[PDB]
Ligand SMILES: OC[C@H]1O[C@H](O[C@H]2[C@H](O)[C@H](O)CO[C@]2(O)CO)[C@H](O)[C@@H](O)[C@@H]1O
């Protein structure tokens with residue numbers, strides 16, 4: 001299809017079009033990307049991801065068209081600790097993507113350790129909400145919580161300082177304009193606190209024509225819940241300037 | 242997802258979200274539901290169907306909601322014979338639906354001979370564009386080409402006279418309104434000739450919560466091509482009393 005859209009105001013338990021990988025599962029009409037115990041508390045060493053089953057036509061070589069897409073979603077992070085880790089990410093990748101070996105912790109379940117910072121060895125665009133930055137294990141991170149745009153590398157090509165708020169839902173809008181090639185990210189807490197970051201990227205030279213979109217989260221030795229509460233996505237192929 | 246939408250202005254051969262069954266396949270940016278030879282001429286004894294891979298959430302028992310959906314599509318039929326057969330149909334059935342054994346010809350690849358008219362043995366709603374009505378074989382049809390609403394049976398619960406026009410595209414709009422439970426069909430030719438038929442049906446007593454949507458067509462001894470040219474679909478769960 002030239003255009004595709006779907007909306008999940010909430011996440012009832014009987015899903016049919018979601019691919020669950022790792023420890024992701026539905027609980028209380030929301031997706032718990034990372035594992036939790038009996039009483040609902042976050043645990044260490046856990047990775048989880050979800051992907052919508054239908055493939056998205058990001059760009060078409062023959063018509064020379066590129067998709068204009070928009071992803072809106074909201075998540076909350078909760079942890080008994082004040083050092084919640086490691087973060088959640090919205091990503092776009094080849095249709096057959098799977099959790100790479102040893103991609104837990106700071107790799108957010110998106111990259112393999114050996115190639116985490118090798119751009120020519122990956123095919124993924126992700127918007128990360130990173131809450132852990134210890135310079136010993138996450139040597140690639142700026143020294144503070146942040147929102148980052150990741151293009152084939154765990155080391156963001158662009159970031160903005162971010163504030164983690166326990167149990168507070170963050171509303172996020174991600175838009176890609178094929179006409180300007182700008183990937184814009186706008187995140188806001190209910191009180192109006194706003195965060196913005198954008199980067200120019202030619203999705204055609206990064207990803208195949210058909211892809212899958214989803215979310216990933218992980219927790220290494222430090223933990224927190226990564227709760228996806230709602231998600232809408234729309235994509236339309238367009239002839240650009 | 243509560244809402245799902247997709248549009249195929251055309252059908253490039255590079256498809257990922259379509260489920261092809263029988264002889265259905267892409268040729269010339271269009272879906273040829275029934276088999277055609279090297280020259281593109283229709284052949285006898287062929288059945289074919291396509292289904293969008295993503296399941297549509299038609300209704301939700303818990304929330305007491307029922308989907309509002311619209312399907313807009315266009316097709317053309319062509320045959321050197323004076324009695325091209327057998328017809329094309331847009332249908333809605335359970336997710337695991339497959340072509341029934343012996344469902345060729347007049348059964349449109351939708352029903353098995355043994356229960357083609359047993360409304361308790363089937364789960365399918367279809368809008369058929371039936372061009373073959375020979376009273377000796379298709380005993381269940383009115384004696385003329387017609388558009389029919391099929392609810393669990395090849396014997397339409399409602400039919401209206403229709404004109405078959407070789408090589409001319411018919412634009413069809415099929416909508417369902419959960420508040421009135423009206424399934425409306427409006428079809429037009431490029432010259433303004435209009436056909437419309439409506440029927441009240443509670444989809445919850447006929448189909449399961451999750452379904453797949455698609456098209457089916459078949460040719461028995463008589464034949465014609467059944468070319469699906471474009472298709473857009475959308476559905477949203479809504480509250481009903
Ligand atoms: O495709 C038309 C029609 O073809 C078959 O019906 C034939 C009978 O099998 C018999 O040979 C007498 O002639 C027909 O009625 C017409 O050719 C299929 O059996 C039908 O299902 C189909 O509608």
Ligand SMILES: OC[C@H]1O[C@](O)(CO)[C@@H](O[C@H]2O[C@H](CO)[C@@H](O)[C@H](O)[C@H]2O)[C@@H]1O
Pocket residue numbers: 085086104105106107132134136137138219220221222223
């Ligand atoms: O003593 C090293 C030990 O402590 C960290 O640097 C911080 O807890 C550890 O790194 C692990 O845990 C991090 C937080 O969850 C995660 O980001 C790392 O990926 C993971 O290796 C290191 O194990």
Ligand SMILES: [Ca+2]
Pocket residue numbers: 086106130131132133138141
């Ligand atoms: Ca980190």
Ligand SMILES: [Ca+2]
Pocket residue numbers: 327328347371372373374379382
């Ligand atoms: Ca017939």
Ligand SMILES: [Mn+2]
Pocket residue numbers: 128130140141142146148154156
């Ligand atoms: Mn980071």
Ligand SMILES: [Mn+2]
Pocket residue numbers: 369371381382383389395397
């Ligand atoms: Mn009929």
